[PDB]
Structures are given as C-alpha cells and as structure tokens.
Design an enzyme around this catalytic site. Structure first.
Site, mmCIF file in Angstrom:
data_model
loop_
_atom_site.group_PDB
_atom_site.id
_atom_site.type_symbol
_atom_site.label_atom_id
_atom_site.label_comp_id
_atom_site.label_asym_id
_atom_site.label_seq_id
_atom_site.Cartn_x
_atom_site.Cartn_y
_atom_site.Cartn_z
ATOM 1 N N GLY A 98 -5.200 26.302 -40.277
ATOM 2 C CA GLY A 98 -6.205 26.681 -41.248
ATOM 3 C C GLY A 98 -7.454 27.181 -40.567
ATOM 4 C CG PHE A 117 -18.823 23.891 -39.918
ATOM 5 C CD1 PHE A 117 -19.973 24.152 -39.191
ATOM 6 C CD2 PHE A 117 -18.947 23.361 -41.190
ATOM 7 C CE1 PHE A 117 -21.221 23.896 -39.724
ATOM 8 C CE2 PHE A 117 -20.193 23.100 -41.730
ATOM 9 C CZ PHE A 117 -21.331 23.368 -40.995
ATOM 10 C CB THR A 141 -9.864 28.099 -36.727
ATOM 11 O OG1 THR A 141 -8.538 28.431 -37.154
ATOM 12 C CG2 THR A 141 -9.982 28.277 -35.227
ATOM 13 C CG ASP A 164 -17.722 16.138 -45.900
ATOM 14 O OD1 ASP A 164 -18.558 16.620 -46.692
ATOM 15 O OD2 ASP A 164 -16.732 16.775 -45.482
#
Ligand code: X4Q
Lengths: 286, 279, 65
Positions: free
Chosen positions: A10, A14, A16, A113
């Site tokens: 993905g 920010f 990969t 988060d």
C-alpha cells in the site's frame, strides 16, 4: 539490501509499505519525524498486542522500518459483509485491544490514532496496535499536545473541544467507537466536519451538562450545543447484553476522568461473563 | 519506563574497565583502518577521552544558549547520545564538532521538541554559508548517529526521578522538613555526575538518589532513615548495602574526574585537525 | 475459556509505588501542581503527573548491571 522485496502492500500520505522476506517494510528537515517517533517508541515496548519493530535501516535522510507482517486489520473485518461478528469475536477483539492499550498506558504512552485499520491481525489471530506515528508519551505537565490527533470519526469530544492536555480517555473513546463499529458494521459517528462530529455525538448520546462533565465549558473550542436527549443505548445496540451496555457506557462517558481506563475496562463483568472470547486461531478471516 | 528500557538493557555497563575497553577497541579499530587504507598523528584512548570531555562541554554550552529555550531533558538526551557514540567510535574518524551537533539535532527530534532545521542552525555562531554547511553535515551524520546508537533513542534522564524523590521526601519523610533546600546542591552534584561516565554505569534513579543524599550529607543531614525505613531497606540488609556502595562509588567517580586542561586541549585539537586533514 | 483479569506485573527493581487512586489519601498530591479546570476537562489530573514522577524515582533503584 538484506530484505528481498515480495509485494507492494500500500501507499499512504506518509509512507509506503512492502511485504518482503516474512516482514513488512515501511519506506533540509532531515529524517522523517513520524518514522523517528515509531522507532523511538516501539524500541521501548514489548507486548504481544503491540506491533513489533524488528529492524530499521535507510540511506541519507530516508529511512525504512521493518515490522512483523500482519495479515489483515479490523477495518477489513468490519467492512466484510460475508463475516459475522459474533459476541465472542467482538469480545476477543476488544480484549486484545484493551490488553495492548493497558500495557501502552502503563508505560505512559497514548496511541492517539486508534481506528479499525490501525488494529492489525496476524495469521494467528493476534490483534496488534500499529501505526505509532502519532503516539506520544503522556503524564508530563510541561508538554502540550495537538487536538488534531485521532481520525475525526473516532475523536473524543474533549479532543473535538480543543483539549491540549488529555489522558488515556482519547484512546478509550476511540476504543468505544471501534466497539460500536464492531456492533453496527458501520462507522458509529461519521461526521463530515468537527462541528458535524460533535453534532452526531450529541444526537446519539445526548448533550452533556456540568453534571456529566464538570468543566466542559473551560475547553478552548467548546461551543454550546442544543440540549439533545440522545438515543438510549439498547436502542442503538439491540443485540447488546447488559454487561456490554455497561462497558459501552463506560467507554462513552463524556467525562474523560470518569471514562473507564483500560485496566478498569478489563475488570468489567463483560469480559468475565459468558461467552468467553474467541481464541485467536478461531477468529474470522477474510 | 527504565526498568524494561533499552538504556538499562544495552547502555548500562558493569564497570569503568568495560568502557575503557570499548574506547580502546574503537581507537585501535580506527588505527588499523587508517593503516590499511593509507606515528604522532594518531591519538591514544586517553587523548580521545580528553577531546570527548571537551566536546561534551561544548555540546552543553551549545544547548544552554539554544533558542528557543531548550528543555533540559533534550540536553540530557543529546549528551547521552554523545557519550554512547564515542563509546564505540573514534573522534579521529568522525569529528566530535559535527557529532555533537548531530546529537543535539536528533535529541530535539526524539524528545518531540519541534524546531525547524534553519532555526536549529541559526543558533550556531557562524556565517550563513557556515550554517548551511553545518546543516548539510548534520543531515549526512544523522542516520550514522542513529545507527551507532543501535536505534535506541529514548534516554532516561535522572531529572524526573529527582522530582519523584523530592515528592516522596516531602510526603513520607517529615524528618527532612523542607526537601526543597536539597535541590540546588543536588542539581549541582547531578551536573558533576553528568561529566563522568556514571550515566553509562548507574540507573537514573540511583544517580538522582545519590545526588540528593550527597546534598543532604553536604548540608549536614544524615538522612539514612529514608533508606532504612521509608524505602523498606531495613528488612533487606543486602539491598541496603548494595545501594550504599553504589552511591559511594558514584561519589568516588565524581571525586576522581579531572576537567580537561586548556593548552593540553589545544595540542589535541591540533592533533585531531591533522588527523581529519591528512585523511 | 472465560477471561480472568490477571494484572500484568513488571519488575521495577525499586520501592513500591502507591497506587494511582491512593495518592490523594496519602498526601502526595499536596506536593504537585494542581491541575487547571482545562486539564481536568480533557482528563488530565495532577495525580497522573505525581504517579509518573514517583514511578520514575523508584524505577531500578535496586538494579545492578
Ligand atoms: C506494521 C505495518 C507496517 C504493517 C504490517 N503489515 N501490514 C500490511 N499487511 C497486509 C494488510 C494488512 C491489513 C489490511 C490489508 C492488508 C499492510 C500495511 N499497509 C496497507 C494496509 C492499510 N493501508 C496500506 N501495513 C502493514
């Protein structure tokens, strides 16, 4: 390098992610502060329900982080209409999340988060908290925090009201939202903006007063809403048991101090009553 | 938390002998590398130690005038980075002038003390071209410094344990009526303890307690009952003795530390400049 | 298998730290800065800072390398 790339997993704003040999590598200011935050925190933590940072390398000012490869996350489970989330499965996910969060809070770190796609599942059914790029240490009085943390759908009302200082409640509220998402299979409070998020919160759980939130009016971004009655919890979650309703109410208390901690949540009857949580090997997989 | 941290596990060493062995191995490894790739140019380990002490002082001075106000935890983390880097690296290979600035930069990032790179390099008393060159050097050395720290960036300083011990004294030790009077001198002793190798040999709590008790002894107060009774060490004799000798050895390390001399440092600075120019 | 809450124990190598709720009863909070109403509204209490400071003070006091 020492890791042979296997697949592209993905791409994000920010970084990969690539699957490699099994591990997952996440690729004038200098080295990225998100990667540094992840390294500095995950080096100091060791727990089954927290993502393990196996290695780190890089060149010049770019840096790659190596984590254990996780098969799925809770977002894929929730959005999969072909998997039924039984009470045992929900209890197991909640238990692993709360154990990881209790370990994290004991070491004075807030995830900040929490959301279904940040709760990854390994091949063995072990839930691990991940994406510590917003995680921060708490308990210090001389350090201020940003209220932008947590994705808006899972942001606590104290965060939505501009709280620069907060404790484990910001995670706990998100946990509650995750729990709601596990029961309804849809986002509990999908606000299009901060104002809409607060509106949905108060329309679903009523408008808190000073009796439920003794100092809410002191929050910097607090705006007086309409005095909604909300909806009773058993109407939102018809299949929820009484113990699960008590857990939800504790997680969704408007007062962050009154909001149950991870330790307190783990001690609730819901986790000790029948049925017991599903073992990791038996949890549903896409 | 310190009790399961990387600082406790990998960066707290048994004795001064192990630290001297690490520094000597680094010096010898650089000597072998320079001989193979390429003698009064080379520096002996004690000379490297003098240079490292000088540049740790330089790093402290840099952090004490940094704008905006630089948290003391950040400074402690940076100084710990400097010490750890030169445990296994020679000042002849990597210049401490750049390494100390890289340590400050990395510490500012790690502690979550947000500051922009131009704002960081503006604190250097150099011309703008010098500041840009220093920034480029820091950017080059940041990943190297992180690798040489084995990606162990969280540093447990003794200041928070010092605060916790003060809270405990104010609460559970009425014999000491005002523990606040212990602060300044204890902090002073803390500073001295920072100049030695104690940060690599003792826990931050041990260092903070040693500083507090040195302040108490210097003030004329024998507050051993805090250890015996409040800290429960009356039932455990082995623990009491094993703590007392730790504080005694810390005090002896502070006693035997010697600040670098001026013209001696000048000679070794010329030696290091020759080492970095001939290479 | 029904879950049973086992409180995870981590060796701190130091004196016992009083539990979070007992700090006010034992008089610790009299020596830490009081939290402002803003901090309380967000869930921040002086008790957290006091507990963290005490835990850091007692962590690894008895440990030897
Ligand atoms: C610790 C972290 C670096 C990690 C570990 N595994 N993993 C994976 N594995 C495969 C997977 C997992 C979950 C859902 C789908 C696919 C994907 C991924 N990023 C994707 C998934 C969301 N945005 C891009 N990050 C990771």
């Amino acid at each position: 390098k020492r890791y042979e790339k296997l697949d592209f997993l993905g791409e994000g704003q920010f970084a990969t992610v690539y699957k490699a040999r099994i591990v997952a590598i996440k690729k004038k200011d200098g080295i990225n502060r998100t990667a540094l935050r992840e390294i500095k925190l995950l080096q100091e933590l060791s727990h089954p329900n927290i993502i393990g940072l196996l290695d780190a390398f890089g060149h010049k000012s770019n840096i790659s982080l190596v984590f254990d490869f996780m098969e799925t996350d809770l977002e894929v489970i929730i959005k999969d209409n072909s998997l039924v989330l039984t009470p045992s499965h929900i209890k197991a996910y909640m238990l692993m999340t709360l154990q990881g969060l209790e370990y994290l809070h004991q070491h004075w770190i807030l995830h900040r988060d929490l959301k279904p796609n940040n709760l990854l599942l390994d091949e063995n059914g072990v839930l691990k908290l991940a994406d510590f790029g917003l995680a921060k240490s708490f308990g210090s009085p001389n350090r201020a925090y940003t209220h932008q943390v947590v994705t808006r759908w899972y942001r606590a009302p104290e965060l939505l009201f501009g709280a620069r200082m907060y404790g484990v409640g910001v995670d706990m509220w998100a946990v509650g939202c995750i729990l709601a998402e596990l029961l309804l299979r849809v986002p509990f409070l999908p606000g299009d903006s901060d104002l809409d998020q607060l509106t949905r919160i108060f329309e679903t759980l009523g408008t808190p007063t000073e009796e439920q939130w003794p100092d809410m009016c002191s929050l910097p971004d607090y705006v007086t809403f309409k005095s909604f009655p909300g909806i009773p919890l058993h109407h939102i979650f018809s299949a929820a048991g009484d113990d699960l309703l008590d857990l939800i109410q504790g997680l969704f208390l408007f007062n962050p101090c009154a909001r149950i901690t991870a330790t307190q949540a783990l001690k609730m009857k819901y986790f000790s009553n029948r049925p017991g949580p599903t073992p990791g090997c038996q949890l549903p997989r896409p | 938390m310190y009790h399961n941290s990387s600082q406790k596990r990998h960066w707290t060493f048994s004795s001064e002998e192990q630290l001297a062995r690490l520094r000597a191995d680094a010096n010898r490894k650089f000597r072998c590398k320079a001989v193979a790739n390429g003698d009064p140019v080379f520096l002996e380990p004690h000379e490297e130690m003098t240079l490292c002490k000088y540049y740790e002082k330089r790093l402290l001075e840099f952090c004490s005038v940094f704008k905006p106000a630089m948290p003391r935890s950040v400074v402690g983390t940076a100084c710990m980075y400097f010490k750890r880097f030169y445990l296994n690296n020679s000042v002849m290979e990597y210049h401490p002038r750049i390494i100390m600035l890289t340590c400050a930069f990395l510490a500012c990032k790690v502690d979550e003390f947000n500051v922009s790179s131009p704002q960081f390099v503006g604190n250097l008393r150099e011309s703008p071209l010098g500041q840009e060159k220093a920034l480029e050097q820091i950017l080059e050395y940041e990943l190297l410094l992180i690798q040489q720290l084995n990606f162990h960036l969280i540093v447990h300083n003794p200041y928070r344990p010092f605060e916790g011990f003060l809270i405990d004294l104010k609460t559970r030790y009425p014999i000491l009526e005002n523990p606040e009077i212990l602060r300044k001198t204890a902090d002073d002793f803390l500073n001295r303890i920072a100049l030695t190798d104690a940060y690599l040999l003792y826990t931050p709590s041990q260092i903070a307690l040693t500083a507090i008790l040195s302040s108490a002894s210097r003030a004329g107060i024998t507050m051993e009952s805090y250890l015996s009774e409040s800290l429960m060490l009356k039932e455990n004799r082995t623990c009491l003795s094993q703590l007392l000798d730790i504080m005694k050895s810390m005090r002896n390390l502070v006693k035997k530390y010697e600040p670098p001399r001026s013209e001696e440092v000048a000679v070794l600075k010329q030696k290091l400049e020759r080492c970095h120019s001939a290479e | 298998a029904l879950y049973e809450y086992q409180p995870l124990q981590i060796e701190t190598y130091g004196p016992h730290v009083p539990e979070l709720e007992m700090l006010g009863r034992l008089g610790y909070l009299n020596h830490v800065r009081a939290a402002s109403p803003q901090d309380l509204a967000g869930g921040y209490t002086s008790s957290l800072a006091c507990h963290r400071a005490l835990q850091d003070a007692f962590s690894g006091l008895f440990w030897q390398p």
